[PDB]
Amino acid sequence: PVVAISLLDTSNFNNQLDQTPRVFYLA
Amino acid sequence: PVVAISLLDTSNFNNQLDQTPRVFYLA
Amino acid sequence: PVVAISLLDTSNFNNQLDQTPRVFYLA
Amino acid sequence: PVVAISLLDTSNFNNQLDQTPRVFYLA
Amino acid sequence: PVVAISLLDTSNFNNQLDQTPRVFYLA
Amino acid sequence: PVVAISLLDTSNFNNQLDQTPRVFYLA
Amino acid sequence: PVVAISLLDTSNFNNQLDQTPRVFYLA
Amino acid sequence: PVVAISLLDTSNFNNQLDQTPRVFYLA
Amino acid sequence: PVVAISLLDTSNFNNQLDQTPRVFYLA
Amino acid sequence: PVVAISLLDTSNFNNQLDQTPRVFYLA
Protein backbone atom coordinates (compact mmCIF):
# COMPACT_ATOMS: atom_id res chain seq x y z
CA PRO A 1 0.00 0.00 0.00
CA VAL A 2 1.71 3.14 1.33
CA VAL A 3 4.36 4.47 -1.06
CA ALA A 4 5.91 7.83 -0.18
CA ILE A 5 8.49 9.44 -2.47
CA SER A 6 9.60 12.71 -0.87
CA LEU A 7 12.20 15.27 -1.95
CA LEU A 8 12.69 18.05 0.61
CA ASP A 9 15.24 20.67 -0.50
CA THR A 10 15.23 23.30 2.24
CA SER A 11 17.94 25.86 2.94
CA ASN A 12 18.73 29.18 4.61
CA PHE A 13 16.27 29.28 7.50
CA ASN A 14 16.20 30.16 11.21
CA ASN A 15 19.57 31.91 10.95
CA GLN A 16 20.51 35.47 11.93
CA LEU A 17 23.15 37.43 10.00
CA ASP A 18 24.36 40.40 12.07
CA GLN A 19 26.77 42.74 10.28
CA THR A 20 27.34 45.79 12.50
CA PRO A 21 30.76 47.26 11.65
CA ARG A 22 32.08 50.50 13.11
CA VAL A 23 34.34 52.44 10.74
CA PHE A 24 35.96 55.66 12.00
CA TYR A 25 37.64 57.39 9.06
CA LEU A 26 39.19 60.43 10.77
CA ALA A 27 40.99 62.28 7.98
CA PRO B 1 -3.52 2.49 -2.20
CA VAL B 2 -1.85 5.63 -0.80
CA VAL B 3 0.82 7.01 -3.15
CA ALA B 4 2.34 10.37 -2.21
CA ILE B 5 4.94 12.02 -4.45
CA SER B 6 6.01 15.27 -2.78
CA LEU B 7 8.60 17.87 -3.80
CA LEU B 8 9.05 20.61 -1.20
CA ASP B 9 11.59 23.26 -2.24
CA THR B 10 11.54 25.86 0.54
CA SER B 11 14.22 28.42 1.29
CA ASN B 12 14.97 31.72 3.03
CA PHE B 13 12.48 31.77 5.89
CA ASN B 14 12.38 32.58 9.60
CA ASN B 15 15.74 34.36 9.41
CA GLN B 16 16.64 37.91 10.45
CA LEU B 17 19.29 39.91 8.58
CA ASP B 18 20.46 42.86 10.70
CA GLN B 19 22.87 45.25 8.96
CA THR B 20 23.41 48.27 11.24
CA PRO B 21 26.82 49.77 10.44
CA ARG B 22 28.11 53.00 11.96
CA VAL B 23 30.38 54.99 9.64
CA PHE B 24 31.97 58.19 10.97
CA TYR B 25 33.66 59.98 8.07
CA LEU B 26 35.18 63.00 9.84
CA ALA B 27 37.00 64.90 7.09
CA PRO C 1 -7.04 5.00 -4.39
CA VAL C 2 -5.40 8.12 -2.93
CA VAL C 3 -2.72 9.55 -5.23
CA ALA C 4 -1.22 12.91 -4.23
CA ILE C 5 1.39 14.61 -6.42
CA SER C 6 2.42 17.84 -4.70
CA LEU C 7 5.00 20.46 -5.65
CA LEU C 8 5.41 23.18 -3.01
CA ASP C 9 7.94 25.86 -3.99
CA THR C 10 7.85 28.41 -1.17
CA SER C 11 10.51 30.98 -0.35
CA ASN C 12 11.22 34.25 1.44
CA PHE C 13 8.70 34.25 4.27
CA ASN C 14 8.55 35.01 8.00
CA ASN C 15 11.90 36.81 7.87
CA GLN C 16 12.78 40.35 8.96
CA LEU C 17 15.43 42.40 7.15
CA ASP C 18 16.56 45.32 9.32
CA GLN C 19 18.98 47.75 7.65
CA THR C 20 19.47 50.74 9.97
CA PRO C 21 22.88 52.27 9.23
CA ARG C 22 24.13 55.49 10.81
CA VAL C 23 26.42 57.52 8.54
CA PHE C 24 27.97 60.72 9.93
CA TYR C 25 29.68 62.56 7.07
CA LEU C 26 31.16 65.56 8.90
CA ALA C 27 33.00 67.51 6.20
CA PRO D 1 3.53 -2.48 2.20
CA VAL D 2 5.27 0.67 3.47
CA VAL D 3 7.90 1.94 1.03
CA ALA D 4 9.49 5.31 1.84
CA ILE D 5 12.05 6.87 -0.50
CA SER D 6 13.20 10.15 1.05
CA LEU D 7 15.80 12.68 -0.09
CA LEU D 8 16.34 15.49 2.42
CA ASP D 9 18.89 18.08 1.25
CA THR D 10 18.93 20.75 3.95
CA SER D 11 21.65 23.31 4.58
CA ASN D 12 22.48 26.64 6.20
CA PHE D 13 20.05 26.80 9.11
CA ASN D 14 20.03 27.73 12.80
CA ASN D 15 23.40 29.46 12.49
CA GLN D 16 24.37 33.02 13.41
CA LEU D 17 27.00 34.94 11.43
CA ASP D 18 28.25 37.93 13.43
CA GLN D 19 30.66 40.23 11.59
CA THR D 20 31.28 43.31 13.76
CA PRO D 21 34.69 44.74 12.85
CA ARG D 22 36.05 48.00 14.26
CA VAL D 23 38.30 49.89 11.83
CA PHE D 24 39.95 53.11 13.03
CA TYR D 25 41.61 54.80 10.05
CA LEU D 26 43.19 57.84 11.70
CA ALA D 27 44.98 59.64 8.87
CA PRO E 1 7.06 -4.96 4.39
CA VAL E 2 8.84 -1.80 5.60
CA VAL E 3 11.45 -0.58 3.12
CA ALA E 4 13.06 2.79 3.87
CA ILE E 5 15.62 4.30 1.48
CA SER E 6 16.80 7.60 2.97
CA LEU E 7 19.40 10.09 1.76
CA LEU E 8 19.98 12.94 4.23
CA ASP E 9 22.54 15.49 2.99
CA THR E 10 22.62 18.20 5.66
CA SER E 11 25.37 20.75 6.22
CA ASN E 12 26.23 24.10 7.79
CA PHE E 13 23.83 24.32 10.71
CA ASN E 14 23.85 25.30 14.40
CA ASN E 15 27.24 27.00 14.02
CA GLN E 16 28.24 30.57 14.88
CA LEU E 17 30.86 32.44 12.85
CA ASP E 18 32.15 35.45 14.80
CA GLN E 19 34.55 37.72 12.89
CA THR E 20 35.21 40.82 15.02
CA PRO E 21 38.62 42.22 14.05
CA ARG E 22 40.01 45.49 15.39
CA VAL E 23 42.25 47.33 12.92
CA PHE E 24 43.93 50.56 14.06
CA TYR E 25 45.57 52.19 11.04
CA LEU E 26 47.19 55.25 12.63
CA ALA E 27 48.96 57.00 9.75
CA PRO F 1 33.22 60.12 -0.29
CA VAL F 2 31.65 56.94 -1.69
CA VAL F 3 29.83 55.02 1.04
CA ALA F 4 27.76 52.04 -0.13
CA ILE F 5 25.71 49.96 2.32
CA SER F 6 24.02 47.16 0.38
CA LEU F 7 21.86 44.22 1.46
CA LEU F 8 21.00 41.80 -1.36
CA ASP F 9 18.73 38.99 -0.12
CA THR F 10 18.02 37.00 -3.28
CA SER F 11 16.80 33.41 -3.48
CA ASN F 12 15.07 30.83 -5.66
CA PHE F 13 16.08 31.87 -9.16
CA ASN F 14 17.30 30.21 -12.37
CA ASN F 15 16.32 26.75 -11.12
CA GLN F 16 14.06 24.20 -12.82
CA LEU F 17 11.85 21.87 -10.79
CA ASP F 18 10.72 18.93 -12.93
CA GLN F 19 8.22 16.58 -11.28
CA THR F 20 7.06 14.05 -13.90
CA PRO F 21 5.96 10.91 -12.04
CA ARG F 22 4.43 7.88 -13.73
CA VAL F 23 1.84 6.04 -11.62
CA PHE F 24 0.16 2.88 -12.96
CA TYR F 25 -2.54 1.75 -10.52
CA LEU F 26 -3.71 -1.35 -12.39
CA ALA F 27 -6.44 -2.62 -10.07
CA PRO G 1 37.11 57.41 0.70
CA VAL G 2 35.51 54.23 -0.64
CA VAL G 3 33.71 52.35 2.14
CA ALA G 4 31.61 49.37 1.04
CA ILE G 5 29.57 47.34 3.54
CA SER G 6 27.84 44.53 1.66
CA LEU G 7 25.67 41.62 2.80
CA LEU G 8 24.76 39.16 0.03
CA ASP G 9 22.49 36.38 1.33
CA THR G 10 21.74 34.35 -1.80
CA SER G 11 20.49 30.77 -1.93
CA ASN G 12 18.73 28.16 -4.06
CA PHE G 13 19.71 29.15 -7.58
CA ASN G 14 20.89 27.43 -10.78
CA ASN G 15 19.89 24.01 -9.47
CA GLN G 16 17.61 21.45 -11.11
CA LEU G 17 15.40 19.15 -9.02
CA ASP G 18 14.23 16.19 -11.12
CA GLN G 19 11.73 13.88 -9.40
CA THR G 20 10.54 11.32 -11.97
CA PRO G 21 9.43 8.22 -10.06
CA ARG G 22 7.87 5.17 -11.69
CA VAL G 23 5.29 3.37 -9.53
CA PHE G 24 3.57 0.21 -10.80
CA TYR G 25 0.89 -0.87 -8.32
CA LEU G 26 -0.32 -3.99 -10.13
CA ALA G 27 -3.03 -5.20 -7.76
CA PRO H 1 41.00 54.70 1.70
CA VAL H 2 39.36 51.51 0.42
CA VAL H 3 37.58 49.68 3.25
CA ALA H 4 35.44 46.70 2.21
CA ILE H 5 33.42 44.72 4.76
CA SER H 6 31.66 41.89 2.93
CA LEU H 7 29.48 39.01 4.14
CA LEU H 8 28.53 36.51 1.41
CA ASP H 9 26.25 33.77 2.77
CA THR H 10 25.46 31.70 -0.32
CA SER H 11 24.19 28.13 -0.38
CA ASN H 12 22.39 25.50 -2.45
CA PHE H 13 23.34 26.43 -6.01
CA ASN H 14 24.47 24.66 -9.19
CA ASN H 15 23.47 21.26 -7.82
CA GLN H 16 21.16 18.69 -9.40
CA LEU H 17 18.95 16.44 -7.26
CA ASP H 18 17.75 13.45 -9.29
CA GLN H 19 15.25 11.19 -7.52
CA THR H 20 14.01 8.60 -10.05
CA PRO H 21 12.91 5.53 -8.07
CA ARG H 22 11.31 2.46 -9.64
CA VAL H 23 8.74 0.72 -7.43
CA PHE H 24 6.99 -2.45 -8.64
CA TYR H 25 4.33 -3.48 -6.12
CA LEU H 26 3.08 -6.62 -7.87
CA ALA H 27 0.39 -7.78 -5.46
CA PRO I 1 44.88 51.98 2.69
CA VAL I 2 43.20 48.78 1.48
CA VAL I 3 41.44 47.00 4.35
CA ALA I 4 39.28 44.02 3.37
CA ILE I 5 37.27 42.09 5.97
CA SER I 6 35.47 39.24 4.20
CA LEU I 7 33.29 36.39 5.47
CA LEU I 8 32.30 33.86 2.79
CA ASP I 9 30.01 31.16 4.22
CA THR I 10 29.18 29.04 1.17
CA SER I 11 27.88 25.48 1.17
CA ASN I 12 26.05 22.84 -0.85
CA PHE I 13 26.97 23.71 -4.42
CA ASN I 14 28.06 21.89 -7.59
CA ASN I 15 27.05 18.51 -6.17
CA GLN I 16 24.70 15.93 -7.68
CA LEU I 17 22.51 13.73 -5.49
CA ASP I 18 21.26 10.72 -7.47
CA GLN I 19 18.77 8.50 -5.64
CA THR I 20 17.49 5.88 -8.11
CA PRO I 21 16.39 2.85 -6.08
CA ARG I 22 14.76 -0.23 -7.59
CA VAL I 23 12.20 -1.93 -5.33
CA PHE I 24 10.42 -5.10 -6.48
CA TYR I 25 7.78 -6.08 -3.91
CA LEU I 26 6.49 -9.24 -5.61
CA ALA I 27 3.81 -10.35 -3.16
CA PRO J 1 48.75 49.24 3.69
CA VAL J 2 47.04 46.04 2.54
CA VAL J 3 45.30 44.32 5.45
CA ALA J 4 43.11 41.33 4.54
CA ILE J 5 41.11 39.45 7.18
CA SER J 6 39.28 36.59 5.48
CA LEU J 7 37.09 33.78 6.81
CA LEU J 8 36.06 31.21 4.18
CA ASP J 9 33.77 28.54 5.66
CA THR J 10 32.89 26.39 2.65
CA SER J 11 31.58 22.84 2.71
CA ASN J 12 29.71 20.18 0.76
CA PHE J 13 30.60 20.99 -2.84
CA ASN J 14 31.64 19.12 -5.99
CA ASN J 15 30.63 15.77 -4.51
CA GLN J 16 28.25 13.18 -5.96
CA LEU J 17 26.06 11.02 -3.71
CA ASP J 18 24.78 7.99 -5.64
CA GLN J 19 22.29 5.81 -3.75
CA THR J 20 20.97 3.17 -6.17
CA PRO J 21 19.87 0.17 -4.09
CA ARG J 22 18.20 -2.92 -5.54
CA VAL J 23 15.66 -4.57 -3.23
CA PHE J 24 13.85 -7.74 -4.31
CA TYR J 25 11.23 -8.67 -1.71
CA LEU J 26 9.90 -11.84 -3.35
CA ALA J 27 7.25 -12.90 -0.85
Residue numbers in the entry:
A (entry chain E), B (entry chain C), C (entry chain A), D (entry chain G), E (entry chain I), F (entry chain B), ...: 164 to 190
Quote the authors verbatim.
PM1 exhibited a characteristic twisted architecture with an 800 Å half‐period twist, corresponding to the 90 nm pitch observed by AFM. To build the atomic model of PM1 and identify the fibril‐constituting protein, we performed de novo model building using ModelAngelo without sequence constraints. Structural analysis further revealed that Val186 resides within the PM1 dimer interface, where spatial constraints favor small residues (e.g., valine in glycinin G4/G5) but exclude bulkier ones (e.g., arginine in glycinin G1/G2/G3). This strongly supports glycinin G4 and G5 as the fibril‐forming proteins. To discriminate between them, we observed that Leu170 in G4 fits the density map more accurately than Pro170 in G5, leading us to select the Pro164‐Ala190 segment of glycinin G4 for final model building. The PM1 core comprises residues Pro164‐Ala190, with Val166‐Leu171, Leu180‐Gln182, and Arg185‐Leu189 forming β‐strands. Importantly, Cryo‐EM analysis of PM1 revealed a structurally unique dual‐core architecture that deviates from conventional amyloid folding patterns. PM1 features spatially segregated hydrophilic (Asp172‐Asn178/Asn178’‐Asp172’) and hydrophobic (Val166‐Ile168/Val186’‐Pro184’) domains, a structural motif distinct from previously characterized amyloid folds in both pathological and functional contexts. The unique dual‐core architecture of PM1 fibrils confers exceptional interfacial properties through precisely organized surface domains. Hydrophobic edge residues (Phe187‐Ala190) facilitate adsorption at oil‐water interfaces, while adjacent hydrophilic regions (Asn177‐Arg185) maintain colloidal stability in aqueous environments.
